[PDB]
Design an enzyme around this catalytic site. Structure first.
Site, PDB file in Angstrom:
ATOM      1  N   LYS A 196       0.793  -1.251   0.000  1.00 18.05           N
ATOM      2  CA  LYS A 196       0.000   0.000   0.000  1.00 18.05           C
ATOM      3  C   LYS A 196       0.829   1.306   0.000  1.00 18.05           C
ATOM      4  CE  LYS A 196      -3.980  -1.669  -0.540  1.00 18.05           C
ATOM      5  NZ  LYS A 196      -4.418  -3.056  -0.844  1.00 18.05           N
ATOM      6  N   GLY A 256       4.057  -0.430  -5.211  1.00 22.96           N
ATOM      7  CA  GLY A 256       2.893  -1.302  -5.322  1.00 22.96           C
ATOM      8  C   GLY A 256       3.277  -2.711  -5.753  1.00 22.96           C
ATOM      9  N   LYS A 278       6.930 -10.006  -4.149  1.00 23.33           N
ATOM     10  CA  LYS A 278       6.957  -8.677  -4.729  1.00 23.33           C
ATOM     11  C   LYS A 278       7.107  -8.823  -6.216  1.00 23.33           C
ATOM     12  CE  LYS A 278       9.555  -4.388  -4.548  1.00 23.33           C
ATOM     13  NZ  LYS A 278      10.888  -3.831  -4.191  1.00 23.33           N
ATOM     14  N   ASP A 306      16.056   2.294   5.670  1.00 18.02           N
ATOM     15  CA  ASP A 306      14.684   2.605   6.029  1.00 18.02           C
ATOM     16  C   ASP A 306      14.300   1.917   7.326  1.00 18.02           C
ATOM     17  OD1 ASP A 306      12.282   4.093   5.672  1.00 18.02           O
ATOM     18  OD2 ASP A 306      11.311   2.406   4.646  1.00 18.02           O
TER      19      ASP A 306
END
Lengths: 281, 324
Positions: free
Chosen positions: A16, A20, A37, A128
């Site tokens: 989300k 995507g 993915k 991240d």
């Protein structure tokens, strides 16, 4: 070529936030639950070799604190990348059910730090780190998302498909574009820590464009309220504006806050349980 | 506290691992001894809270040429600790770039051990080692005298199968080496392509035909890169002459994939831009004259953006319109 559309079953989507197309899935062969993915490659359009770089780097990790990579399959011109799937949820997810103890927080940070130490030793980095990328197994194991994983001399922010779209967890030397290494992950960790304690990162309520220009100018964020001194102290350790004055992960691994407070990783299944009990359907 | 014993402990513990049963006798101890050696070895080379101590580094090197420790290591590698494999890579890759004078001693004492290289390339058949072996190989084809070996090899043309291989990851890594061979050493590579033109391009023409979207795209792209090099001027002139090569690109321009066509274009334009087109080119161009202007007029006119592409386009059309 053996086509993944019959090798794997796609289930609910979970992609989300970014590009995507990240799905929960099943290895039809072995009933093992995976993350799938799918990348277009046609409509890429940050080059092919960039994507293979992401994989080369990811497949080099075999740590129980970084999410495993299981391989990839090409269907015509889409690429299925299969990775370990963690059915506990993300720490971010788990906060939806209520706050965390210091013992719980410290347990997590301990594991992330081990992941981080493993990465840093291979001159890899994360890039991240955030509660959303603090991932848990159903038995309470804790590991970093594969999303951030990168090589020590790779600019992950230039490329689509890797860039971070919010400045909140970013170190000031990164925002300033200047020379930066693994010490920047340590900064992100400090933010994550505040986030785990407060539910959101410093200055969430602010416009990302104001934020970017404060993160270098202002004093570093701090932990505030009903938390122990050693916790607050851990977070100052991480959030030094000077990268050099930040402890390595190895050093943080034996900070008082971690040593006093961390516990058996199994105890975290109470969180997983609380969450299951909390959510609807 | 020793920088000249770890070798006398692997030419020991590594020698142990072949043959032996999956039996306990060497299952745990013997293999784990190996991994602990490779860590202490990499340490003499990389600075935990220590420095790269030079005197010990010289000793370290003139210990490995004793005798073929690396040969059977690289051979019987498929049975090593996962993190041990990664360790070996790190080890091999830095002693390789050792230097005395402006001279690389490792490189020389491999020009005898010519098989080390082909073992490494044969690694591409065993998926549990292929990638490590890539990492190592690419690090040696990185030195001029070493690339020379694989290039003029019979074993060179095994790449065309290694590139088409089953698992996409390894097919990729293979192609990476294949590429790095043909591009890195410019003067050397241009030598190879002149002499083996005929054979090389027969196989290559297959890649362009085989899809596999990634194989097709990457090699079409690599063709462009090898063609506009300048170092390769002789090779490209020979190439843009064959009317088989122009019919191929023409069909690639017709491909289902936007990105493949666009790549095909950059090769195709060099055919037309040629000031010295041989007859068979002009024949096939003149034959298809109307349908080409027809095509280039509407070929990807969403790109603007691209001054150079449209420029190359009005140019290409002028040229095709202007004959005979």
């Amino acid at each position: 070529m053996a086509d993944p559309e019959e090798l794997f079953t796609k289930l609910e989507r979970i992609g989300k936030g970014s590009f995507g197309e990240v799905f929960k899935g099943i290895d039809n062969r072995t009933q093992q639950v995976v993350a799938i993915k799918i990348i277009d490659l046609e409509e890429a359009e940050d080059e092919i070799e960039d994507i293979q770089q992401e994989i080369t780097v990811l497949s080099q990790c075999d740590s129980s604190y970084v999410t495993k990579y299981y391989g990839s399959y090409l269907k015509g011109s889409k690429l299925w990348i299969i990775m370990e799937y963690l059915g506990g949820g993300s720490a971010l997810d788990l906060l939806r059910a209520g706050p965390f103890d210091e013992f719980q927080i410290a347990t997590m940070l301990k594991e992330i730090l081990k992941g981080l130490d493993y990465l840093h030793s291979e001159k890899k980095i994360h890039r991240d780190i955030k509660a959303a990328n603090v991932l848990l197994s159903e038995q309470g194991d804790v590991k970093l998302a594969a999303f951030g994983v990168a090589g020590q001399l790779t600019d992950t922010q230039i490329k689509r498909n890797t860039f971070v779209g919010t400045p909140f967890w970013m170190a000031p030397e990164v925002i300033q574009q200047s020379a930066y290494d693994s010490k920047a992950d340590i900064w992100s960790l400090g933010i994550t820590a505040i986030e785990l304690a407060k539910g959101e990162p410093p200055n969430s309520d602010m416009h990302p464009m104001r934020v970017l220009f404060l993160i270098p100018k202002n004093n570093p964020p701090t932990l505030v309220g009903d938390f122990t001194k050693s916790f607050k102290e851990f977070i100052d350790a991480c959030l030094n504006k000077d990268p050099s004055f930040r402890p390595t992960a190895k050093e943080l691994l034996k900070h008082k806050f971690i040593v006093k407070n961390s516990k058996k990783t199994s105890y975290l299944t109470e969180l997983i349980d609380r969450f299951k009990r909390w959510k609807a359907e | 506290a020793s920088p000249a014993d770890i070798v006398k402990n692997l030419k020991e513990s590594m020698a142990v691992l072949e043959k032996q049963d999956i039996s306990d006798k060497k299952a745990e101890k013997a293999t784990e001894e190996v991994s602990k050696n490779l860590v202490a070895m990499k340490e003499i080379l990389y600075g935990n809270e220590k420095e790269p101590q030079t005197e010990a580094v010289a000793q370290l090197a003139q210990e490995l040429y004793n005798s073929g420790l690396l040969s059977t290591l690289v051979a019987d590698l498929q049975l090593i600790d996962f993190e041990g494999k990664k360790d070996v890579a790190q080890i091999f890759n830095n002693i390789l770039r050792r230097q005395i004078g402006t001279r690389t001693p490792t490189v020389e004492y491999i020009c005898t051990q010519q098989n080390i290289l082909f073992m490494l390339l044969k690694g591409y058949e065993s998926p549990e080692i292929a990638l490590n072996c890539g990492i190592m190989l690419r690090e040696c084809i990185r030195h001029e005298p070493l690339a020379k070996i694989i290039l003029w090899s019979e074993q060179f043309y095994d790449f065309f199968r290694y590139v088409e291989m089953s698992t996409f990851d390894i097919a990729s890594d293979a192609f990476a080496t294949f590429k790095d061979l043909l591009t890195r050493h410019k003067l050397l590579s241009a030598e190879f392509l002149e002499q083996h033109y005929d054979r090389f391009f027969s196989e290559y023409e297959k890649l362009l035909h085989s899809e596999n979207y990634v194989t097709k795209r990457q090699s079409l792209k690599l063709l462009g890169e090898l063609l506009l090099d300048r170092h390769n001027f002789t090779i490209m002139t020979k190439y843009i002459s064959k009317p088989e090569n122009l019919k191929l690109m023409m069909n690639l321009l017709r491909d289902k994939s936007r990105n493949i066509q666009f790549e095909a274009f950059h090769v195709f334009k060099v055919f037309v831009a040629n000031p010295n087109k041989t007859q068979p080119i002009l024949d096939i161009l003149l034959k298809n004259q109307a349908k080409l202007i027809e095509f280039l007029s509407k070929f990807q006119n969403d790109r603007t953006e691209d001054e150079q592409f449209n420029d190359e386009k009005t140019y290409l059309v002028k040229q095709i319109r202007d004959l005979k």
